[PDB]
From Swiss-Prot, chain A:
<dbReference type="GO" id="GO:0032543">
    <property type="term" value="P:mitochondrial translation"/>
</dbReference>
<keyword id="KW-0496">Mitochondrion</keyword>
<keyword id="KW-0689">Ribosomal protein</keyword>
<dbReference type="Pfam" id="PF01161">
    <property type="entry name" value="PBP"/>
</dbReference>
<comment type="similarity">
    <text>Belongs to the phosphatidylethanolamine-binding protein family. Mitochondrion-specific ribosomal protein mL38 subfamily.</text>
</comment>
<dbReference type="GO" id="GO:0005743">
    <property type="term" value="C:mitochondrial inner membrane"/>
</dbReference>
<keyword id="KW-0809">Transit peptide</keyword>
Curated annotation (Swiss-Prot), chain B:
<dbReference type="GO" id="GO:0035928">
    <property type="term" value="P:rRNA import into mitochondrion"/>
</dbReference>
<dbReference type="GO" id="GO:0005762">
    <property type="term" value="C:mitochondrial large ribosomal subunit"/>
</dbReference>
<dbReference type="GO" id="GO:0003735">
    <property type="term" value="F:structural constituent of ribosome"/>
</dbReference>
<keyword id="KW-0496">Mitochondrion</keyword>
<keyword id="KW-0809">Transit peptide</keyword>
<dbReference type="GO" id="GO:0008097">
    <property type="term" value="F:5S rRNA binding"/>
</dbReference>
<keyword id="KW-0687">Ribonucleoprotein</keyword>
UniProtKB/Swiss-Prot annotation, chain C:
<comment type="subunit">
    <text>Component of the mitochondrial ribosome large subunit (39S) which comprises a 16S rRNA and about 50 distinct proteins.</text>
</comment>
<protein>
    <recommendedName>
        <fullName>Large ribosomal subunit protein mL40</fullName>
    </recommendedName>
</protein>
<comment type="similarity">
    <text>Belongs to the mitochondrion-specific ribosomal protein mL40 family.</text>
</comment>
Length: 297, 141, 59
RNA sequence: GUUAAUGUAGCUUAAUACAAAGCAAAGCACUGAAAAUGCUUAGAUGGAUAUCCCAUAAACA
């Protein structure tokens, strides 16, 4: 058969390229049931509706999109964002968990509204002046995955709560007091992820308790993997929420006022200049040949 | 002061840090192949016999944001999976999923007939009003 | 110029006309298969009794 | 009744999970025809479980 449109060849060609082959190619080098029956009944009703048919032919139909979002929510798609941004590799050394509790967080700004914290969202450090609102007996931890200034694997806590009764977070132990974001300048977008871990039994995390207030980076540094490994028996993550933050004026305030340190500033480091090595005695070297080699020409 | 201690060079591990900054590498090869590969993300719109689907796909071929009328939430409020209005809704829904995913920029390369289709044009109108950009920023060298 | 009601009335009959034709096409396609299957089934029946008879028939 | 078939929509062991999917296929518009192209049309678990099951249809009968 011959493709009657370019797309037919393109779609097959695109699919063909994606699939691996024995010959070398670029990619290898560089790379419940009851509910459905109820759903089917709605389809018949929706299709039968004469008004809906008229709207379709009149191209005037509309949708309550807000309902779609709630019904769509979500576990499988929520995992994609966390994995896509590299939370799992940095936070659990590659362990991947499907979030089952629809965790949602927002940074409270003033009193009129609270800034959402989507998956992959961008929130300025200024807007994060105060701690955010997070919505059985579980725990909850805050992380600065790439906000660390000295060690790559290490990361800093904003605030860590343990033994959170049911859902109410006010009763959780404030092991780590809240700290505003402090992303270094020149490093682009820093990803901060919010993790919710199922707590099988209430356990005193004396090891993770930190002085309140604490303004030392030497004690804020920690590792999620080893911390989770120590509690991995009773800890199974289920909630995810992470945003990106750039440098901002508030960051200077955080680094100086309470962190009490000079603001970190970074940029791509260029290689040392390349210098040709001329010969001390240019034996049998004319000026015309040296003229091309030297700057003058 | 202990806090002052900082490494000479930063350690940023965010995959999209370079992409968001614009310094991430875009495929500049494939000079003998069409179309250009100088896009971090692409909008893939698949119109099946009974369903219309739109996706946002990275160069690697893995969809990050997927919007399909096959999804239960959209269809229940959507009369017919194949329709001009459905293209608008999936674009707005795809945008909302893009809003959920944090992806603001994308590269759309419609085919000659696909571009001429009014439904796809309205779907593009759905994306622009939702703020999703059909054109990505240029790479930084 | 046709009125919107006239177009709506005409829009309905085209749907009825399309529905009738598609039903006819589906029935027609099944008729082709049923007769072909019966004709192919007919071929097998006599072959069992005497293959020699078809030798003239197949010509 | 014994053997044996046959029980998602032309096709598929697509699927029983987050969807009853993908594919074949249709009407109208566009006037050599066809194709391409735009807008649109009709649809299924006759049924279970991790073999029974009834329906159906055969050789035994």
């Amino acid at each position: 058969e011959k493709y009657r449109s370019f797309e037919r060849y393109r779609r097959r060609a695109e699919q063909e390229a994606r699939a691996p082959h024995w010959w070398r190619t670029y990619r290898e080098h560089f790379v419940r049931t009851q509910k459905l029956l109820e759903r089917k009944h709605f389809l018949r009703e929706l299709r039968a509706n004469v008004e809906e048919e008229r709207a379709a032919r009149l191209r005037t139909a509309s949708i309550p999109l807000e309902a779609v979002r709630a019904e769509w929510e979500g576990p499988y798609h929520k995992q994609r964002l966390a994995e896509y941004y590299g939370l799992y590799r940095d936070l659990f050394h590659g362990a991947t968990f499907v979030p089952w509790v629809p965790l949602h967080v927002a940074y409270a700004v003033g009193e009129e509204d609270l800034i959402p914290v989507y998956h992959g969202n961008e929130v300025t450090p200024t807007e994060a002046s105060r701690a955010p609102e997070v919505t059985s007996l579980w725990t909850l931890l805050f992380i600065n995955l790439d906000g660390h200034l000295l060690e790559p694997d290490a990361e800093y806590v904003h605030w860590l709560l343990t033994n959170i009764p049911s859902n109410r977070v006010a009763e959780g132990q404030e092991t780590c007091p809240y700290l505003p974001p402090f992303p270094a300048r020149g490093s682009g977008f820093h990803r901060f992820a919010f993790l919710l871990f199922k707590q099988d039994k209430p356990i005193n995390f004396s090891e993770d308790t930190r002085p309140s207030p604490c303004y030392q980076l030497a004690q804020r540094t920690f590792r999620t993997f080893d911390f989770y490994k120590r509690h991995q028996e009773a800890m199974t993550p289920a909630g995810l929420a992470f945003f990106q933050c750039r440098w901002d004026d508030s960051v200077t305030h955080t680094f100086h006022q309470l962190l009490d340190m000079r603001e970190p500033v970074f940029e791509f480091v260029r290689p040392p200049p390349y210098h040709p090595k001329q010969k001390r005695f240019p034996h049998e070297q004319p000026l015309r040949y040296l003229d091309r080699y030297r700057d003058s020409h | 002061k202990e806090n002052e201690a900082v490494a000479p060079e930063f350690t940023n591990r965010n995959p999209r840090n370079l992409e968001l900054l614009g310094v991430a590498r875009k495929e500049r090869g494939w000079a003998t192949v069409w179309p250009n590969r100088e896009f971090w993300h692409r909008l893939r719109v698949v119109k099946t016999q009974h369903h219309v689907e739109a996706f946002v796909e990275h160069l690697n071929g893995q969809v990050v944001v997927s919007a399909s009328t096959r999804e239960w939430a959209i269809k229940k409020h959507l009369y017919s999976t194949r329709n001009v209005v459905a293209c608008e809704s999936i674009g707005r829904v795809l945008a909302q999923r893009c809003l959920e995913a944090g992806i603001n920029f994308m590269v759309y390369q419609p085919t000659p007939w696909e571009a001429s289709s009014d439904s796809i044009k309205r779907l593009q109108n759905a994306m622009t009003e939702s703020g999703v950009m059909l054109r990505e920023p240029r790479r930084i060298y | 110029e046709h009125s919107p009601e006239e177009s709506e009335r005409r829009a309905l009959l085209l749907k009825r006309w399309a529905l009738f034709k598609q039903q006819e096409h589906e029935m027609e396609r099944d008729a082709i298969r049923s007769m072909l299957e019966a004709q192919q089934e007919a071929l097998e029946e006599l072959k069992l009794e005497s293959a020699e008879l078809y030798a003239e028939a197949i010509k």
